[PDB]
Design a binder for this molecule. Sequence first.
Ligand SMILES: [Mg+2]
Ligand SMILES: [Mg+2]
Ligand SMILES: [Mg+2]
Ligand SMILES: [Mg+2]
Ligand SMILES: [Mg+2]
Ligand SMILES: [Mg+2]
Ligand SMILES: [Mg+2]
Ligand SMILES: [Mg+2]
Lengths: 176, 192, 97, 139, 117, 43, 211
Amino acid sequence: GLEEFFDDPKNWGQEKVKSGAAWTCQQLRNKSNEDLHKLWYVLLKERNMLLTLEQEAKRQRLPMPSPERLDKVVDSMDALDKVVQEREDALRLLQTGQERARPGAWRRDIFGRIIWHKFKQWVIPWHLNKRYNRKRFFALPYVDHFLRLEREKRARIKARKENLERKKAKILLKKF
Amino acid sequence: LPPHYRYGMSPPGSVADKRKNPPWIRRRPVVVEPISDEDWYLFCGDTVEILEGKDAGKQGKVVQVIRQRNWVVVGGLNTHYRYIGKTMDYRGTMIPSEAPLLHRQVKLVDPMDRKPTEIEWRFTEAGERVRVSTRSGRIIPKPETWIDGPKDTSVEDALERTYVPCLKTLQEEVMEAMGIKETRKYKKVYWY
Amino acid sequence: IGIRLTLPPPKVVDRWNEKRAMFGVYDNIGILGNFEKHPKELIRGPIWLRGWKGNELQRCIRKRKMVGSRMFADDLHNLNKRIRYLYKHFNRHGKFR
Amino acid sequence: ARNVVYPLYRLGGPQLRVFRTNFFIQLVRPGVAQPEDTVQFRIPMEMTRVDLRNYLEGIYNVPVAAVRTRVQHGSNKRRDHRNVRIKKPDYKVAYVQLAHGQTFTFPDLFPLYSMLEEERQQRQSSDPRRGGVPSWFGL
Amino acid sequence: ADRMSKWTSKRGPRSFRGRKGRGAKGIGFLTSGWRFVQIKEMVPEFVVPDLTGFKLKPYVSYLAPESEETPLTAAQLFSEAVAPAIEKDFKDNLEKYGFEPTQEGKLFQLYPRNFLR
Amino acid sequence: GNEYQPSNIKRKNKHGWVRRLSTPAGVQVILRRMLKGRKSLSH
Amino acid sequence: FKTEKEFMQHARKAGLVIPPEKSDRSIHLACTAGIFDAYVPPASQVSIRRIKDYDANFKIKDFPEKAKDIFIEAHLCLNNSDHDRLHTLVTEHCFPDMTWDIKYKTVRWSFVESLEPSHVVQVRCNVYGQITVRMHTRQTLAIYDRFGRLMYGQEDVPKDVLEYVVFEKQLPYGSWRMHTKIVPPWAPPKQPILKTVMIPGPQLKPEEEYE
RNA sequence: GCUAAACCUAGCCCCAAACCCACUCCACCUUACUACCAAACCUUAGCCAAACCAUUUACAUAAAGUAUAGGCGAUA
RNA sequence: CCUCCGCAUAAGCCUGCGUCAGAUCACUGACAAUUAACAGCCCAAUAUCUACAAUCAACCAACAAGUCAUUAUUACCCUCACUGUCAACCCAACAGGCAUGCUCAUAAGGAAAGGUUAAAAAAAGUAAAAGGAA
RNA sequence: CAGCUG
Ligand SMILES: [Mg+2]
Ligand SMILES: [Mg+2]
Ligand SMILES: [Mg+2]
Ligand SMILES: [Mg+2]
Ligand SMILES: [Mg+2]
Ligand SMILES: [Mg+2]
Ligand SMILES: [Mg+2]
Ligand SMILES: [Mg+2]
């Protein structure tokens, strides 16, 4: 019911709620996938509870009772999601040996730079996809000059940074 | 927090800080000397001894360590006096506030000699690294319950290894466990 | 009033620095080391002006032919325009001719 | 879910299923008078009306009957010290009318000082008859 | 006249404002007379479990110990998942042990993905 | 001075990303803005 | 404003949400908000044990001698305005109460011989020792102004002073410092003042009347 | 005595040395930042100098501003 | 007392006289809002059809010759998603301009006067003997 | 031309 968007009605206005730790990752690597599924919905409902409580906290111009447990619940959802992705990845390396879940290719757009192109799903094959074939994955020769100019802008920023680091080091040896 | 943000006695996000360090100020940065993470040897709660200024020779206890400015707040020493709670027409109260100290100005204290000793990080068989004084081979140790609420897992349920490592997906395992049965086979699309 | 009110921090100069104490050593490496090195092989600097002195048009010409192939694009371009300007100045302008 | 590539459906394919839902939700208090059945929520941008119906049905067991969504423009008119516009983020709002004649009202959420307060009671403001003379002295 | 502002759906003439949307995914398609057909199968079903008798709360008690992070590499998952079956069937066709060469016959294909999340 | 008489169709069709990439000259326009370091390469 | 409630209600009406943040450092007080047991003037060897178990070298038979020198020397620090010694001689509950009103005017307090011997009266008790002493002295005052013209007390003439001075000690590096000074309700009025005072009536807005 | 005035240190410049960058997830050549349907190369010109302008006019050391070229002139 | 203005949509703009609070002829911060039926966003192929304007369309009247359409077979069964919706607003000027539908003096929208005096000169309006372009 | 008009 909708009362699951709000916590225990005893806690209303108490300005401090004892919550435990977050889930770390290693505690969660011991749980089955069915158990991580169910824990995902536990943490999901808890997160919606705390977000309603934040928005009502800003509405009534008051501070949160305890804003820490929102950080803990986001912490736990992050750890849980990371664990599940680990198991997907390891199984993908065994069964197929790929490293990305989604295919792509190193291509090179109109602007000369090398880009990881992530593939999208389509229904028709690429040679008669009318919109895909309007994209240019090649740079013509009027770009190579700008590639050189960009290369030199990066080299100037790097040179300035490295030199500036050495000057600061000299000031530290003069001061100490 | 911006570049060349100046650290102070207030924590880096408080109200007093945003009064002191608004997002548009630019000050001369403090040249602090580089102390490596492995080489910082004053911890919160160490009994120390002040070498310079007022309260020289007195042995206090480190309360806060502001490590970005090589700082030690010896609680109860190196004090000036500020008012607090000053309203429009009440003069507040007089309070002994504490000015910090650089790590150079403070030395540690042997718990059996009560003397200002140099500290080197020697190594030990039992513990990989710990502080050892110089005037004696003495290990000066690093210094310093709970009932669960209705939404904490007990230590029992938090540590049950319910995970049998298999070669199935979370998706496939939940489809089996939830009793969801999918007859339609997935139809191959193009990726480009 | 562009004058400073407090006098600046003092300039502590170490006359017996490592550099100052050993300045000038091996300037006579030629004349009392059997001429195996010239003193001009003691100086460090840009590669196009080690043991060479010129006015500015000559420094620019020498820099272009010695290092100009690996100069950056708009530095090379600025330097070509400086030679073109300094050419048109030394050769066509002045008092004495 | 949000920030995920959805797999492409071809005609005769399996059901698209989400196992761990990415997008959260928060039910807000209405700023205007609302019918008793209506409940207001702040959906995230990518969540449709249908996703919200199945979301409340599946997870919270709420009998939802109607859903209507509006996208709210947050202001891009307030500036830094650098005269650069800060944007308050846009957000989607869901108005959910509950079924079976049920009714929701937003609950009334939110219904050393010894030293200071025990010197604020011993203040003892100066007598006007004392005429500025410090009353510390026993004379 | 703005360039700095994000080009959102609120912004063009009518023909512009109709086309651009936010990040939501298409559920069906338009037909003649602008009649939207919704496809049941494109709408995501929230597979939601039964939480009855479930012993995991959202927080962990502080009395639980500290452990070391050991991410699941494919060597580990091969070791525990596969290695007993190979040790047993070697002391006494790799597809026997939970390996599949292709997965074009499979519902939850691992590369490229078909499942969500 | 009411020379600017706005519409978004003329603005995107005149100076948008797609018209800029349609020609080699326009691609060089984008590349110059990308090299100056601009926040808006186009409309 | 005038209190904390006015500021927090104004910060709620404005929208200033001030989050109460958790800091590991607190304020290291060395004083007390007032007096432990208000000695009302005309058995406490408990607290003498609870002092000697910390200090362990403490003779009460020598203390009102010491309490004389903590008193008198502190008052001479008003003649020069030497605040840095006063922080050694006086507590921080007592420092503003004796130095605030005296700012921007010169005082010329002086001591002359006591009529009676000073004698300790009572003793009470993270731990704060607190000793009240009776002193019956003869002192001289002359409080001047910013402009150096006399506004209190003849400079030469000694006056007889009763002084129920309360001392306090922290119980590591602390000592006995003047904490307060009890003035009994029966005490005679002080010296009158050299100038005259008008005390205003109620400032009436037009809608109200004087009654 | 107001308005003000002062201030060092952000950073930068020139060298040297060394051959740089670039897929968390998602989106991005359609009206870029939008989940998903039937074609590239082709002498630079001119300013300017020649006191005009019309051919012409620069783009390690040393030989050497030599041989040469050139309205045999500017110059190269 | 004005009202040659209004109210809506279009284009444009993008939170720009909502509430709470504060600083400043006498904007800043917080919070809240615009809910689709109106409007955008359409269409399975392959063939094959589309001589006779509109004008109260009746004749009559014409020339400058016109704004509107299917059939045959095949395929086809799910259904209401997404986006726009606020304002005292835009382009200019430091006067002006603006598409369309209604209302044609208004049921809607507003105020020419900070206070005074009642000089000159200047602007605009009204009145003017006799004369009537001198 | 006649007429009107600061
Ligand atoms: Mg809407
Ligand atoms: Mg010429
Ligand atoms: Mg309709
Ligand atoms: Mg409207
Ligand atoms: Mg009206
Ligand atoms: Mg006026
Ligand atoms: Mg006139
Ligand atoms: Mg007349």
